[PDB]
Design an enzyme around this catalytic site. Structure first.
Site, PDB file in Angstrom:
ATOM      1  N   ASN A  12       0.821  -1.208   0.000  1.00  0.00           N
ATOM      2  CA  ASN A  12       0.000   0.000   0.000  1.00  0.00           C
ATOM      3  C   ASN A  12       0.855   1.258   0.000  1.00  0.00           C
ATOM      4  O   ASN A  12       0.467   2.274  -0.586  1.00  0.00           O
ATOM      5  CB  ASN A  12      -0.942  -0.001   1.204  1.00  0.00           C
ATOM      6  CG  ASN A  12      -2.340  -0.472   0.850  1.00  0.00           C
ATOM      7  OD1 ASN A  12      -2.706  -0.534  -0.324  1.00  0.00           O
ATOM      8  ND2 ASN A  12      -3.133  -0.791   1.866  1.00  0.00           N
ATOM      9  N   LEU A  61      -3.003 -20.938 -15.384  1.00  0.00           N
ATOM     10  CA  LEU A  61      -2.386 -20.612 -14.102  1.00  0.00           C
ATOM     11  C   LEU A  61      -1.119 -21.417 -13.854  1.00  0.00           C
ATOM     12  O   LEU A  61      -0.232 -20.964 -13.119  1.00  0.00           O
ATOM     13  CB  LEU A  61      -3.384 -20.842 -12.966  1.00  0.00           C
ATOM     14  CG  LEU A  61      -4.631 -19.959 -12.970  1.00  0.00           C
ATOM     15  CD1 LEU A  61      -5.608 -20.433 -11.911  1.00  0.00           C
ATOM     16  CD2 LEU A  61      -4.257 -18.499 -12.749  1.00  0.00           C
ATOM     17  N   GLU A 113       1.292 -21.871 -15.780  1.00  0.00           N
ATOM     18  CA  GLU A 113       2.438 -21.204 -16.378  1.00  0.00           C
ATOM     19  C   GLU A 113       3.028 -20.125 -15.482  1.00  0.00           C
ATOM     20  O   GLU A 113       4.156 -19.690 -15.731  1.00  0.00           O
ATOM     21  CB  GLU A 113       2.040 -20.608 -17.732  1.00  0.00           C
ATOM     22  CG  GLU A 113       3.190 -20.483 -18.720  1.00  0.00           C
ATOM     23  CD  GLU A 113       2.738 -20.601 -20.167  1.00  0.00           C
ATOM     24  OE1 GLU A 113       1.552 -20.922 -20.396  1.00  0.00           O
ATOM     25  OE2 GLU A 113       3.571 -20.379 -21.073  1.00  0.00           O
TER      26      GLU A 113
HETATM   27  N1  LIG Z   1      -5.341  -1.250  -1.442  1.00  0.00           N
HETATM   28  C1  LIG Z   1      -6.382  -1.398  -0.632  1.00  0.00           C
HETATM   29  N2  LIG Z   1      -6.171  -1.713   0.690  1.00  0.00           N
HETATM   30  C2  LIG Z   1      -7.221  -1.868   1.525  1.00  0.00           C
HETATM   31  C3  LIG Z   1      -8.521  -1.715   1.071  1.00  0.00           C
HETATM   32  N3  LIG Z   1      -9.350  -1.924   2.120  1.00  0.00           N
HETATM   33  C4  LIG Z   1      -8.607  -2.210   3.216  1.00  0.00           C
HETATM   34  N4  LIG Z   1      -7.287  -2.167   2.857  1.00  0.00           N
HETATM   35  C5  LIG Z   1      -6.130  -2.432   3.714  1.00  0.00           C
HETATM   36  O1  LIG Z   1      -6.403  -3.600   4.452  1.00  0.00           O
HETATM   37  C6  LIG Z   1      -5.863  -3.510   5.752  1.00  0.00           C
HETATM   38  C7  LIG Z   1      -6.935  -3.907   6.760  1.00  0.00           C
HETATM   39  O2  LIG Z   1      -7.571  -5.092   6.329  1.00  0.00           O
HETATM   40  P1  LIG Z   1      -9.142  -5.185   5.965  1.00  0.00           P
HETATM   41  O3  LIG Z   1      -9.340  -5.621   4.528  1.00  0.00           O
HETATM   42  O4  LIG Z   1      -9.845  -3.875   6.243  1.00  0.00           O
HETATM   43  O5  LIG Z   1      -9.637  -6.304   7.020  1.00  0.00           O
HETATM   44  P2  LIG Z   1     -10.828  -7.350   6.745  1.00  0.00           P
HETATM   45  O6  LIG Z   1     -10.481  -8.329   5.659  1.00  0.00           O
HETATM   46  O7  LIG Z   1     -12.107  -6.618   6.419  1.00  0.00           O
HETATM   47  O8  LIG Z   1     -10.953  -8.158   8.129  1.00  0.00           O
HETATM   48  P3  LIG Z   1     -11.674  -7.550   9.442  1.00  0.00           P
HETATM   49  O9  LIG Z   1     -10.631  -7.196  10.478  1.00  0.00           O
HETATM   50  O10 LIG Z   1     -12.596  -8.615   9.994  1.00  0.00           O
HETATM   51  O11 LIG Z   1     -12.473  -6.326   9.056  1.00  0.00           O
HETATM   52  C8  LIG Z   1      -5.413  -2.074   5.948  1.00  0.00           C
HETATM   53  O12 LIG Z   1      -4.007  -2.046   5.964  1.00  0.00           O
HETATM   54  C9  LIG Z   1      -5.933  -1.331   4.734  1.00  0.00           C
HETATM   55  O13 LIG Z   1      -5.011  -0.377   4.268  1.00  0.00           O
HETATM   56  C10 LIG Z   1      -8.743  -1.397  -0.260  1.00  0.00           C
HETATM   57  O14 LIG Z   1      -9.887  -1.254  -0.687  1.00  0.00           O
HETATM   58  N5  LIG Z   1      -7.667  -1.239  -1.108  1.00  0.00           N
END
Ligand SMILES: Nc1nc2c(ncn2[C@@H]2O[C@H](COP(=O)(O)OP(=O)(O)OP(=O)(O)O)[C@@H](O)[C@H]2O)c(=O)[nH]1
Ligand SMILES: Nc1ncnc2c1ncn2[C@@H]1O[C@H](COP(=O)(O)OP(=O)(O)CP(=O)(O)O)[C@@H](O)[C@H]1O
Ligand SMILES: Nc1nc2c(ncn2[C@@H]2O[C@H](COP(=O)(O)OP(=O)(O)O)[C@@H](O)[C@H]2O)c(=O)[nH]1
Ligand SMILES: CC(=O)N1c2ccccc2CC[C@@H]1C
Ligand SMILES: [Ca+2]
Ligand SMILES: [Ca+2]
Ligand SMILES: [Ca+2]
Ligand SMILES: [Mg+2]
Ligand SMILES: [Mg+2]
Ligand SMILES: [Mg+2]
Lengths: 54, 352, 438, 425
Positions: free
Chosen positions: C206, C252, C254
């Site tokens: 990120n 997949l 490959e």
């Molecule tokens: N690139 C990107 N990163 C995301 C996005 N949504 C959440 N993140 C990243 O995901 C991390 C947190 O994980 P989440 O996906 O929110 O957690 P979850 O899978 O919903 O699991 P829970 O804890 O139960 O809510 C953070 O570091 C965020 O920056 C997204 O839409 N795009």
């Protein structure tokens, strides 16, 4: 600097370039991992209730 | 209020930098493990470069160029000079050298013997010197058997290079010497050369008929102060500075230090640093690097300059600690973290 | 034709999946109502796009996907968004309380109660496949669902689909877009239990997406939408071979064969360019040499690190747009004379190259401008270990104090699963250093 | 649908809880009778977190008013928004607690506890998915302190996997009703150390000193102190009441703020805090220099006397979220000697576009600092000063308590301070 395996179709083409030559757990074991932690939760919650009963 | 950390307590150079940073009342030192820092004075070995530049909002500077060891290792340097076309095997200012691995472990043993057998057949002076980075451990001999046999008795990588059998000797005395120049490279990769250099001279008369005794051939500062009996006779601490050494060249050989030796040194520093610029440049990186370098040159009786080695963690001359360190903050640190001359450096312009 | 089933797990996976199928539809010419005019085979056909879409008797092209979240808020946007008519409701699975950024909660506590349900919905998409290749699993490292439930799903998928390949798209945690403090713990937990179950994984840091949006797109504070519309471009380029006619990366299998000679070291580094802001009036269209040369700049990497200080094990170049082979090799020569590319002595110093003539598709009103050519370079460098090294360090700083450990033990995980996971990363770091340094 | 069940106990509990509902009810556009009259859909997005939806588009706070005497709750029912509360949610007795923890926890309170839980059960049964509970109350008195902790011990017994949050007012001799407040406070602290996930510590001395020194009130009143807690309670519950990329969950916030089960006592803070020079707009840097300044913190603990375990700041208003990030990073990177270095990135920031009533923008601070030990140190000191002479013990031993229980409460808190001490080095 050789080029080999040149494939050409209508939507593109692909090839290979060579610069230099070279020199699990079962379904039973996962159900046990899961139920094992489910037991350590039941034990901890039981000890909390026992504590609250005291 | 900039912040910095210290990860090399044995660094005589940057120990003064930390003292000047605090003296300005505008820098603050942190624990050696706190990751919220602007500047890192890192450890010598295994500096965690991968961890720098990942703290949001902080511009981070470090005092080591990742990859500089390519230039400061006896073996790596040799391999760099021979393989890099910017230097080529025909590099004119670097002694004919070879990388030799002990037989208990590529390796240039056979190539070395060829140039050795050619010299022995041509009546040419065939004295060679063996050394390594793991030394305080050097051997100078005219026989290839003794050189190779000495390396097999160890267990690390060694290098054998042609021993300069015609070194320029200072008078009176008839003694060897080497030149140490300090060169600074800032984040933008400008190559500043400290105007002050030193000559770590030998207090013993050179003797080309007895390489057994290694006190008149090695000009190191620790060997002349422990195994030499004329320490400090001609100059204080076996160290002659560019002011005196310049006059000597004028009184004896009728020439200046700038023309006779400095031009070549300035060309060797440039050539070595320009070579590895694409590999260590922090121009488009997430952090910034700067590193102090100590080149060690040899001068022969033809007034030709040879490159001995490059020290990546060098120590300075006692008399030049203040001026140099103060300049390190001026051009290297404050140039990124400004504070609220007549530069003491000679900028070696080049093409990036 | 062989189908590919995509699995999106958690907020990060679901939202990123939202931006990928939006892009797939804009690419393959699919409308939001599921209709595809160019598809002359109504309700049938084994075309290249059929690897990702199915067809109904009413001409609808339905993605071969499954969204899973332990909380309905994020997937609920999908059910009422613009592409609500592409998926039928069974493809969207949601719990009621999330995993609270707690790996243990996503793997054990809440995962156990929903795992059998997910596998069954997947079993339904599988029954439609005449020859399922494998799965593409999008998820995050930091999330409690994205880390905890993914590893549990991966374990079961290797049991119900032994011979099928599994690729991940994992989101590396970056503090600039995260309010969670325990993400290091989850990352290392999930990488330990997933490692043996993933044949190839594309990490996206990120922090790298964030800066690419601020530097190239001039977005002061980027949203997830910005980060996802960009991440989906990379995903699109990495899957294009599977959805279009071609010869490189046609299934997949490959991806492991071309990018992973050592199974554990299955984390390639992605690079992409050009990324040009649409707010710019007009840009000087880059040549093949300029966009290829950019693949060796740190600013364009999905994971910040210095590839100049590693050793490549394999390397693919995927071009899209006005690109012909002659121009590719031209730039390659120019670069092999300026850059620092150190290959391992047991792998050829060669690049496999694929070219798709259709240029990269951009979302209307999006942040990315339309370019005539672009490249995505997948290179397996030991330099990516820096990522593990950073994360591992943060793990060690907290575990030395057992900070936040109680939230994990209280969900049924034993404290030993920490050090065991960590000792597996210490092993993983070692394998990278045994392969890269002299 | 992640509903919270609000509980306010005792005199201080209900008066503070009253103004709390008066504050957020205004932010969500709910009038005194429960009818919505806002203008932005953001007001209703997460409205069901603190409000139940009745017939005719009526919103009824999910609150339960508890007290052992009728006095205070009589006033609430006839206050500004008194009519808005559920009539059945008023559960009270007539004996009063005499500012005695023993009475609230063992004798009088015990006789009334079962009925309160009967109401809590009714509210939980209607919750689609219950996040957890939050209890406002003081610890110096008898009902909110004595029966309050009794409620928690029984709510945790019936909902052991739900979050238990509390706003607890701590007693200070400078703002004291009775001399036994240290006795009542020390007894309550031991309960909260065991049966709560998060406890916002509010020191009535800090509230007073903020009102006398900062706000420039020549004579503050409990009403004045309560306005602060109102605004502070609204501040920390913004993540829960309004939409945002944060995804705020009581269990998620606890997981991110509590590295150790027993160190869950937070210092809240609010900014701005202007005396009446009140219409001056506030730049983002100013919000942040005040938000971290001790004079804007309400635990009466100098953070420069300890180290931050975790920090959670919330910003409200139409401001440059880019400028927010730069300023938070500036405060961190200018005093990194007060944030423990063994928890990476232990400062998190959330933004919200809806400002509180009558403010262009504001900031709320939630810190888990070890300097809170100074709080428990004062209480433990005031406690032993009397317990060494058994002074006033008869009020308690008369209600069935033994001296042994007091010596235990003592040690339990001295241990809590030692625990807060080893993490400061
Ligand atoms: N690139 C990107 N990163 C995301 C996005 N949504 C959440 N993140 C990243 O995901 C991390 C947190 O994980 P989440 O996906 O929110 O957690 P979850 O899978 O919903 O699991 P829970 O804890 O139960 O809510 C953070 O570091 C965020 O920056 C997204 O839409 N795009
Ligand atoms: N090929 C050669 N010809 C002449 N002299 C040589 C030589 N190789 C080494 N020397 C002598 O050895 C000394 C330098 O040794 P070297 O630098 O290799 O060891 P070292 O690195 O441990 C000392 P330092 O790093 O402190 O300068 C010089 O004074 C020089 O006189
Ligand atoms: N902030 C605030 N504190 C109060 C208020 N009323 C009482 N207190 C504090 O609470 C303690 C007394 O508790 P009390 O409310 O009488 O408990 P009760 O027995 O449940 O009614 C004392 O330390 C008071 O300072 C109030 O309205 N606001
Ligand atoms: C009675 C009252 O309103 N308060 C109080 C309560 C107890 C002791 C002193 C004081 C002083 C003002 C403070 C606000
Ligand atoms: Ca078709
Ligand atoms: Ca497998
Ligand atoms: Ca009675
Ligand atoms: Mg040396
Ligand atoms: Mg979630
Ligand atoms: Mg009272």
């Amino acid at each position: 600097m050789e080029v080999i395996e040149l494939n050409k179709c209508t939507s593109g083409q692909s090839f290979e370039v060579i610069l230099k030559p070279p020199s699990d757990p079962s379904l039973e074991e996962i159900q046990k991992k899961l139920e094992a932690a489910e037991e350590r939760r039941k034990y901890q919650e039981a000890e909390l209730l026992k504590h609250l009963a005291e | 209020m900039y912040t910095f950390v210290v990860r090399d307590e044995n660094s005589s150079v940057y120990a003064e930098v930390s003292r000047l940073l605090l003296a300005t009342g505008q820098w603050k030192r942190l624990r050696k493990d706190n990751p919220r820092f602007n500047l890192m004075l890192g450890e010598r070995n295994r500096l965690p470069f991968g961890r720098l530049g990942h703290e949001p909002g902080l511009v981070q500077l470090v005092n080591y160029y990742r990859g500089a060891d390519k230039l400061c290792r006896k073996a790596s340097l040799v391999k760099l000079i021979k393989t890099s076309p910017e230097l080529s095997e025909s590099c004119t200012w670097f002694p004919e050298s070879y990388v030799i691995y002990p037989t208990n472990l590529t390796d240039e043993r056979e190539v070395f013997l060829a140039a050795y057998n050619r010299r022995r057949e041509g009546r040419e002076g065939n004295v060679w010197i063996a050394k390594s980075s793991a030394g305080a451990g050097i051997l100078i001999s005219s026989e290839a058997s003794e050189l190779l046999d000495f390396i097999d008795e160890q267990g690390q990588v060694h290098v054998i290079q042609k021993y300069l059998e015609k070194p320029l000797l200072l008078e009176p005395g008839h003694r060897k010497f080497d030149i140490r120049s300090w060169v600074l490279v800032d984040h933008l990769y400008n190559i500043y050369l400290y105007r002050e250099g030193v000559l770590r001279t030998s207090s013993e008369p050179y003797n080309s008929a007895n390489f057994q005794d290694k006190t008149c051939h090695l000009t190191n500062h620790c060997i002349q102060k422990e195994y030499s009996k004329n320490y400090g006779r001609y100059e204080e601490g076996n160290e002659m500075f560019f002011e005196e050494f310049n006059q000597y060249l004028m009184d004896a050989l009728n020439t200046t230090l700038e023309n006779s030796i400095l031009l070549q040194i300035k060309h060797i520093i440039r050539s070595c640093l320009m070579c590895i610029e694409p590999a260590i440049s922090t121009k488009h990186l997430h952090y910034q690097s700067f590193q102090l370098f100590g080149f060690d040159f040899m001068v022969d009786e033809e007034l030709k300059v040879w490159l001995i080695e490059v020290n990546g963690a060098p120590a300075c001359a006692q008399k030049l600690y203040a001026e140099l360190c103060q300049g390190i903050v001026d051009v290297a640190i404050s140039s990124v973290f400004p504070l609220a001359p007549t530069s003491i450096f000679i900028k070696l312009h080049h093409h990036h | 034709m062989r189908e590919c089933i995509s699995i999106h797990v958690g907020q990060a996976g679901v939202q990123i999946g939202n931006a990928c199928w939006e892009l797939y539809c804009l690419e393959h010419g699919i409308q939001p109502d599921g209709q595809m005019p160019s598809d002359k085979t109504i309700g049938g056909g084994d075309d290249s796009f059929n690897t990702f879409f199915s067809e109904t008797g009413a001409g609808k092209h339905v993605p071969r996907a499954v969204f899973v979240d332990l909380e309905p808020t994020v997937i609920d946007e999908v059910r009422t968004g613009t592409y609500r008519q592409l998926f039928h409701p069974e493809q969207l699975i949601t719990g009621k309380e999330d995993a609270a950024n707690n790996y243990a909660r996503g793997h054990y506590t809440i995962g156990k109660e929903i795992i059998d349900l997910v596998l069954d919905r997947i079993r339904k998409l599988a029954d439609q496949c005449t020859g399922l290749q494998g799965f593409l699993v999008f998820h995050s490292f930091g999330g409690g669902t994205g880390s905890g439930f993914t590893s549990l799903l991966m374990e079961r998928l290797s049991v119900d689909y032994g011979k099928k390949s599994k690729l991940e798209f994992s989101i590396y945690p970056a503090p600039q877009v995260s309010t969670a403090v325990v993400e290091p713990y989850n990352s290392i937990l999930t990488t330990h239990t997933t490692l043996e179950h993933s044949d190839c994984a594309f990490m996206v840091d990120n922090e790298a997406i964030y800066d690419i949006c601020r530097r190239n797109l001039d977005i002061e504070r980027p949203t997830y939408t910005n980060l996802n519309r960009l991440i989906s471009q990379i995903v699109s380029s990495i899957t294009a071979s599977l959805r279009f006619d071609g010869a490189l990366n046609v299934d997949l299998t490959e991806f492991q064969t071309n990018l992973v000679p050592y199974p554990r070291i299955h984390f390639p580094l992605a690079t992409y360019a050009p990324v040009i802001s649409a707010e710019k009036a007009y840009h000087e269209q880059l040549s093949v040499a300029e966009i290829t040369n950019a693949c060796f700049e740190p600013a364009n990497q999905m994971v910040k690190c210095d590839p100049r200080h590693g050793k490549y094990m394999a390397c693919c170049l995927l071009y899209r747009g006005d690109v012909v082979p002659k121009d590719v090799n031209a730039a390659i020569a120019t670069i092999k004379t300026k850059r620092s590319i150190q290959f391992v002595d047991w792998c050829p110093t060669g690049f496999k190259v694929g070219i798709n003539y259709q240029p990269p598709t951009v979302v209307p009103g999006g942040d990315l401008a339309k370019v005539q050519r672009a490249v995505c370079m997948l290179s397996n460098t030991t330099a990516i270990a820096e990522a593990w090294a950073r994360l591992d360090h943060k793990f060690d700083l907290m575990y030395a104090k057992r900070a936040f450990v109680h939230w994990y033990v209280g969900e049924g995980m034993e404290e030993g699963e920490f050090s065991e996971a960590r000792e597996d990363m210490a092993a993983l770091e070692k394998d990278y250093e045994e392969v890269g340094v002299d | 649908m992640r509903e919270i069940v609000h509980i306010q106990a005792g005199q201080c509990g209900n008066q503070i809880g009253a103004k709390f509902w008066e504050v957020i009810s205004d932010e969500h556009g709910i009038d005194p009778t429960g009818s919505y009259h806002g203008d932005s859909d953001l007001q209703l997005e997460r409205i069901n977190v603190y409000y139940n939806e009745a017939t005719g588009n009526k919103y009824v706070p999910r609150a339960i008013l508890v007290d052992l005497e009728p006095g205070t709750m009589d006033s609430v029912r006839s206050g500004p928004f008194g009519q808005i509360f559920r009539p059945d949610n008023f559960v009270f007795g007539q004996s009063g607690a005499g500012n005695n923890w023993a009475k609230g926890h063992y004798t009088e309170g015990a006789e009334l506890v079962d009925s309160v839980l009967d109401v809590v059960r009714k509210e939980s049964e209607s919750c689609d998915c219950l996040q957890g509970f939050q209890l406002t109350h003081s610890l110096g008195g008898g009902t909110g302190s004595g029966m309050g902790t009794l409620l928690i011990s029984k709510i945790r017994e019936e909902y052991p996997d739900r979050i238990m949050n509390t706003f607890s007012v701590m007693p200070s001799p400078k703002v004291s009703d009775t001399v036994v407040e240290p006795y009542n406070a020390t007894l309550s602290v031991h309960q909260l150390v065991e049966n709560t996930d998060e406890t916002y510590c509010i020191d009535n001395e800090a509230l007073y000193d903020i009102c006398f020194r900062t706000l420039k009130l020549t004579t503050p009143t409990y009403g004045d102190l309560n306005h602060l807690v109102s605004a502070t309670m609204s501040g920390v519950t913004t993540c829960l009441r309004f939409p945002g990329q944060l995804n705020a969950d009581l269990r998620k916030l606890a997981v991110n703020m509590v590295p150790f089960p027993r160190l869950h006592f937070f210092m809240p803070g609010f900014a701005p805090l202007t005396s009446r020079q009140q219409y001056r707009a506030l730049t983002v840097p100013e919000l942040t220099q005040q938000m971290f300044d001790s004079k804007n913190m309400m635990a009466a603990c100098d953070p420069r006397h300890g180290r931050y375990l975790t920090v959670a700041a919330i910003f409200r208003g139409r401001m440059s979220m880019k400028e927010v990030d730069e300023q938070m990073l500036n405060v961190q990177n200018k005093n990194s000697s007060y944030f423990v270095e063994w928890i990476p990135n232990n400062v998190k920031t959330a933004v919200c576009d809806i400002p509180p009533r009558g403010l262009k923008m504001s900031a709320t601070f939630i810190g888990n600092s070890t300097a809170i030990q100074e709080l428990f140190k004062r209480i433990s000191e005031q406690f032993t000063a009397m317990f060494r002479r058994k002074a006033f013990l008869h009020w308690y031993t008369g209600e069935g308590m033994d001296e042994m229980e007091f010596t235990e409460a003592e040690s339990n808190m001295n241990d809590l301070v030692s625990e807060y001490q080893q993490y400061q080095d």
